[PDB]
From TrEMBL, chain A:
Listed Pfam families: HTH_1, LysR_substrate
Sequence ranges assigned to domain HTH lysR-type in this UniProt record: 5-62
Entry keyword set: Activator, DNA-binding, Transcription, Transcription regulation
Keyword Iron-sulfur (UniProt): no
InterPro entries: LysR_HTH_N (IPR000847), LysR_subst-bd (IPR005119), WH-like_DNA-bd_sf (IPR036388), WH_DNA-bd_sf (IPR036390)
Gene Ontology CC, one term: protein-DNA complex
SUPFAM superfamilies reported in the protein's UniProt record: Periplasmic binding protein-like II, Winged helix' DNA-binding domain
PANTHER family linked: HYDROGEN PEROXIDE-INDUCIBLE GENES ACTIVATOR, TRANSCRIPTIONAL DUAL REGULATOR HCAR-RELATED
Listed GO MF terms: DNA-binding transcription factor activity; sequence-specific DNA binding
Family note: Belongs to the LysR transcriptional regulatory family.
Organism name: Pseudomonas aeruginosa (strain ATCC 15692 / DSM 22644 / CIP 104116 / JCM 14847 / LMG 12228 / 1C / PRS 101 / PAO1)
GO annotation (BP), single: positive regulation of cell motility
Key word DNA-binding present: yes
Protein name as annotated: OxyR
TrEMBL record, chain B:
Gene coding for it: oxyR
Name of the molecule in the record: OxyR
Protein source organism: Pseudomonas aeruginosa (strain ATCC 15692 / DSM 22644 / CIP 104116 / JCM 14847 / LMG 12228 / 1C / PRS 101 / PAO1)
Family: Belongs to the LysR transcriptional regulatory family.
Domain HTH lysR-type, chain residue ranges per copy: 2-59
Record's GO cellular component terms: protein-DNA complex
Keyword hit for Metal-binding: no
This protein's UniProt keywords: Activator, DNA-binding, Transcription, Transcription regulation
PANTHER family for the chain: HYDROGEN PEROXIDE-INDUCIBLE GENES ACTIVATOR, TRANSCRIPTIONAL DUAL REGULATOR HCAR-RELATED
Length: 296, 298, 302, 295
C-alpha cells in the first residue's frame, strides 16, 4: 500500500464517529483539530472512499464509513488486547461501563441491578442509555456503548449474546375491571380494542401482538400506558419486571397472569467479542441474573 | 320557504281532524292556522286537505305529505335530545399532554384525584417536549397540556398552578451528604449530569447556577436521550450528581442508603407548573376539574 | 323559549360544510352578521356550542358534529316533502358531490365519467379522495352526497349498495423470476420485497389478509409503489382496476394473477337514506356498474 | 507505537518458525524483519519469541500475542474490503422525493432510462409538498428531490432540468374549445379549479394571471386534492376548467372527445423543473445519473 493504515488513524475515526464533534474528538485523542482532520483525510485518501462527509457544517458518517468505523473499533480493541496480554492483570473493574437497555427493560431492571453491582464492583459506575434495539445496536458498533441489554432474538457480527433470564407477561387492568374476578386471563380475550399497545418501534409491541390471536398509543411508554389503564382507558400487557414498578396506592390497577401457555421474552446482554474488559461484562450479567425481578 | 310551524299545523290538523281543536293545540287563532296551512298547500301546489264545509280529511297525496311532515318534526326533536346529552362535559375522554420532567411524577397522584371528581373522564396521556405538546395543542390533538413557565402562545390560555423547587441528588456515600444545603455555585463541575437540549428543565438548572468567567462555563456532563430516571440510576451507581424537581425526589424504589437528596442554599431555584389550553376549547369544565386535581396533587 | 327554524338548521349545516363564514353566508343568500346571529340564537336555545366561539376559525364541537348530522337529515326530509308534493322534478341538473377512497378513485373515475355523461350530461362531479373514515364524516355533514368505498361498510341512516367484486393481482418488474409463473401462490408474498400502503388504507389490511402470516412505505400511494416496483425495489399487490392504469412502455412491469382462491374486495357506494335526489344516486351506481372494470358485478348484499 | 507491519512480522515468523522463510514471505530482508520484531518486543516490554540462537519459537505469552495479532490483521483487512466495495456508487437504492405536480408525470419516463444505465439503482420514491421534501433532503431522509424553481437552500445544490409551459384544460364540449388560445385574464372565475395552498403550482397559476380590481381577487374554486388527476376528472365531467403543466396533458386514459387543452396567449407561463441534493452527499455519481436520466 502507498500508505500504511495506522492505529492512530482508526482511533481518530472511531472517536470522531462517537463524539460527532471535531473539537471533542480532537481533545479526546489529545490533539488539535487540524491534526485529527489531517489524519482522517489521510486515511480517506488511502482507502479511496469518504468515511465522513466533506463538510465542516458538521460531522456526518457516510453509510460506507459506518461499516468502516465498526471494523476499526474491532481492530482497536484487539490491539488493546495485545497490550493487555503483555502487561497482564490490570484492573477491569475501575472505570465506568457504558450500558444501553431497550425502553421496556431499563426502567424495570437498573434499580434492582445497581446495588449488587455496587457490592461487587464499587469502582464501576454506569453511564446509561435507553433506546430502541436498532439504535443500541448502532451504538455498540461505534463503541459509544460497551454492552446492551436487549430481548432475544438478536444477532450481530462479532458480537456475543448471553441469555440472562426469561421474563413472563401479565395483563394490566383497572382495579374495578370485570377481569379482576378471573384468576388468570386467557389470551384470546386480549383481542379487544381496549388493548393499549406500544407504538411501532418497540419489539415488545410485536411480542404482545404475537402472543394474541387494538389501540396503538405511540410516543408513549409502558408508564403512560399504565397511567391510561389506571384512569380507565382500557387494559394492557406488561413484562413481569414492570408489574410492581409504580407509585399507585392499592386499589387502582390490578395484574393477572396469562392462562397457560404463559408468553414470555428472553432478556440478554450483548457486547463486542473484542471487548478488553470481559470481567465487567461478567459482573454486569451476574448482577442482572441475581436481582429480584430476574427470578421465577 | 316552508317552516316547522306550518308542518306542525298540518300534522295537528290531520290528527284532530278539526280546524278549531287543531288551532287550539297550536296556540293560534283559527284564521292564522288556516292561512298557514294552505299558503303551504299553494307553495307545494297540491291539496293536502280536501275541500269541505265540515270534514277535515286527507287527499291521497296529503296522506304521504303529512306522514313525511311528522317524520320531519320527530327528527327535528332529535336535535334537542342530542343537545341535552351534549351538556355534560365530564362524560368523555380528555387528551392530556405533560412534559417529560413533569408527567412521571404527576400522573400517579393525578389519576385517582381526577377519578374522585370526574369518574366518567378517562385520560388519553402523552409525554413529550414542550414545543411538540404546543403543536398538538394547537391542532386539537391534545385538549390540555401541563408545562412550565414561561409559556405564551397565540390563541392559547395559560394558568399557573404551583411552584416546585429543585433538589440535589447524589450517591449516598458522596461527600456532599455531609452538607445541609448545596450552594448552586458548586454544581458547575463535570460530575453534574444534565438532560439533553430540548428539555426546558436543562436550562432551568443551568440558569439556577451563578455566571462564570470566560471558558469554564458548562463543565457539566450532558447525557443525550436521558430521562430523569436514567440520570437517577447513573447517580445511584456512583457516576455523578444531578438536580431533580421536588415531585421526583421520592419517586423511586431504592432502599435507604443508595441515593440522598439535599436542598439548595437560598434562594432555592424553582419552576412554575402551569396548564395551557386553547382559548376557544368548548369544554371548560374539564379544564377546571383538571387544574384543581393537579393542584391537589401538590 | 326560542323555537327552532329550518333556516337556522340550514345556517349551521352550510357553515359546517364550508368551514368559512364568507362562503357559508354567500351560500345562504344572507350577510355574514345575519348568519352569525342565527347560529348564535340556535346555540343559545339548545344551550350548547355547535361551533367553537372563535373569530379566527370555523371549528365544530363534538356535540355539534352529531347535531349537524341530524340537522342535515331534517333538512333533507323537509326537502322530501316538496319531492312528494310535485314529483318529477329534474334531479339530474346539478352537480353531485362524490368521494372515493385513495385506492379506488384514480382507477374508477376515468371509466365512470363517460358513462355518466352519456346518461346524465348535466350532472358534473365534484370529487374528493380520502380515507374511508373521513369520507364517512363528510357524508354525515353533507359535504359529500355519495361515497365509493369497499365493504364492509355500515352506518346509521346511510344506505350501502355493493357494486362489483374486484380481484387483486401481483405486480412485479418485467425481469422478475415470477414472470415465469402463470399464477402466484399467496404464500410466496411473505417476504421483505413486498411493498405495502401505510396503515390508513383498508387496502393494506385486505392485502395482509390475502397473505399467510413486508416493507411499508408510509405516505405512499399505489402509483408511487408502482414506480418503485418498476425500478426493481420489490413487488406489490394491486386491485384489478389499477393494473392497466399507468403510462409505462411495455416490458417494464408485469402483472400475474393469484393462484386460486383469488382474493378480492367488493366495491360499494354509500349515501344518506334521506338524500332527496335518489335518481342521481341511481345513475351514478348504474354508470359504475357499466364500467369495464366492473363487469363481474357482485352477489354481495347489505 | 504498535504497527500492523510489526504484527504481520510476528504472525509470519510464528507460522514459519524460521527467519529466512518469514522475511521472504514478508518481502523484506531478515535484518528488517528482526529489527521490527525486536522493536515490538521492546515496546510491549515482553519477549514474544525465544531469544534463542538455535531455534525460533514462542514464549508462553508470545502465543496469545500472536493469536491476537492475527485477529487484528484479519479485521483490518475487512476495512480494506469494505472500502473497495464502497467505491461503486451505482449499486444501492436511491431515495428520491418529487413534488405532487411533478412525480406522476416524470417517473414513468425516468425509470426505464435510469434502469438502462443503472440497473442496480432501484428507487425509493416519495411524493409530497415542496417544504416537506426540503426538510427530508436536509435531515438526509432523502437523497435527491425533484422540485420547481425558485429553490435555494443552505448547503444544497440545484440543477435545472427543463422548462415546462402551462396549458388550459377544459371539457371537450366547452365553449373555449372554439378559441385558439386562452387569455389568462379569462381564468378569474368560479369555474377555475385550483389546488389548495401548499402546492407551489397554485401560485404559479395565480401569478400567471393579471391582478384585478378590489373585490374580485380570487374567484376560482379551490379543491383539497393533492392531485391534478382528481381535478382532471372533475373537468372531464363538465364541472369547470383548470391548468396543467405540459408534462401532464397527455398523462391520462380518456378517449378523444372527452377533454381538451388550449395554450395560453403569449407570453406563456411556465415552470422550471430542477433536481436538488445536499452538496456533501457522498454519491455524486448516482445523482448525476438520475439527473441525466430525466433528460
Amino acid at each position: 500500500h502507498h500508505h500504511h493504515m495506522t492505529l492512530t488513524e482508526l482511533r481518530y475515526i472511531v472517536t470522531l464517529a462517537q463524539e460527532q464533534h471535531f473539537g471533542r474528538a480532537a481533545e479526546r485523542c489529545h490533539v488539535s483539530q487540524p491534526t485529527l482532520s489531517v489524519g482522517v483525510k489521510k486515511l480517506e485518501d488511502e482507502l479511496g472512499v469518504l468515511i465522513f462527509e466533506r463538510s465542516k457544517s458538521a460531522v456526518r458518517l457516510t453509510p460506507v464509513g459506518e461499516g468502516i468505523v465498526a471494523q476499526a473499533q474491532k481492530v482497536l480493541e484487539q490491539a488493546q488486547g495485545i497490550r493487555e496480554l503483555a502487561q497482564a492483570g490490570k484492573n477491569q473493574l475501575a472505570a465506568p461501563l457504558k450500558v444501553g437497555a431497550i425502553y421496556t427493560i431499563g426502567p424495570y431492571l437498573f434499580p434492582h441491578l445497581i446495588p449488587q453491582l455496587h457490592r461487587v464492583a464499587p469502582q464501576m459506575p454506569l453511564y446509561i442509555e435507553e433506546n430502541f434495539t436498532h439504535i443500541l445496536r448502532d451504538k455498540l458498533r461505534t463503541g459509544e456503548l460497551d454492552a446492551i441489554i436487549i430481548a432475544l432474538p438478536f444477532q450481530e457480527a462479532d458480537v456475543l449474546t448471553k441469555p440472562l433470564f426469561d421474563e413472563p407477561f401479565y395483563v394490566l387492568m383497572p382495579a374495578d375491571h370485570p377481569w379482576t374476578a378471573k384468576a388468570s386471563i386467557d389470551s384470546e380475550l386480549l383481542n379487544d380494542k381496549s388493548l393499549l399497545l406500544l407504538g411501532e418501534g418497540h419489539d415488545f409491541r410485536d411480542q404482545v401482538l404475537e402472543a394474541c390471536p387494538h389501540t396503538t398509543v405511540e410516543s408513549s411508554s409502558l408508564e403512560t400506558i399504565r397511567h391510561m389503564v389506571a384512569s380507565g382507558l382500557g387494559v394492557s400487557v406488561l413484562p413481569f419486571s414492570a408489574v410492581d414498578s409504580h407509585h399507585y396506592a392499592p386499589g387502582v390497577i390490578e395484574v393477572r397472569p396469562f392462562s397457560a401457555p404463559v408468553p414470555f421474552r428472553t432478556v440478554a446482554i450483548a457486547w463486542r467479542a473484542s471487548f478488553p474488559r470481559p470481567r465487567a461484562i461478567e459482573v454486569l450479567a451476574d448482577s442482572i441474573r441475581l436481582c429480584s425481578v430476574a427470578r421465577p
